[PDB]
């Protein structure tokens, strides 16, 4: 229903930085979940980073300390900041939103966005 068209698509040299943005509605009191997911070619979907309703963020061990999932005060847009974007961090990143507090579990998320395209040159 809600067309989002995850933005931030583009290419950048490896080791640099890039920013994504997805129109995902977040909730402060209702227990909701927002997160970014990585669909690497050949590999399968994995959990990049998720943000709870209370602002608590969970990052994958691979991207721990390098990425920063965040959103606006309106919580109508989901922002993913990538720093030191290495060769591994390359995929068709998707934006997902599920209900509940089980934000760090991939099951239950709804990938209703077409997706973005990010690649790094070595």
């Amino acid at each position: 229903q809600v067309q989002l068209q995850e933005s931030g698509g583009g290419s950048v040299q490896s080791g640099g930085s890039l920013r994504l943005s997805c129109a995902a509605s977040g909730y402060t009191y209702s227990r909701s979940c927002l997160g970014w997911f990585r669909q690497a070619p050949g590999k399968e979907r994995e959990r990049v980073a998720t943000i709870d309703s209370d602002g608590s963020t969970s990052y994958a061990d691979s991207v721990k300390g390098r990425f920063t999932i965040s959103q606006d005060n309106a919580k109508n847009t989901l922002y993913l900041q990538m720093n030191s974007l290495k060769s591994e961090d390359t995929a068709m990143y998707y934006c997902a939103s599920k209900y509940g507090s089980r934000c760090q579990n991939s099951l239950g998320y709804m990938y209703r966005g077409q997706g973005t395209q990010v690649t790094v040159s070595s």
Binding site: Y27, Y29, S30
Partner: peptide
């Protein structure tokens, strides 16, 4: 119902 109110306001 603050959570329902927040869902409706969105």
């Amino acid at each position: 119902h603050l959570e329902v109110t927040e869902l409706l306001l969105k």
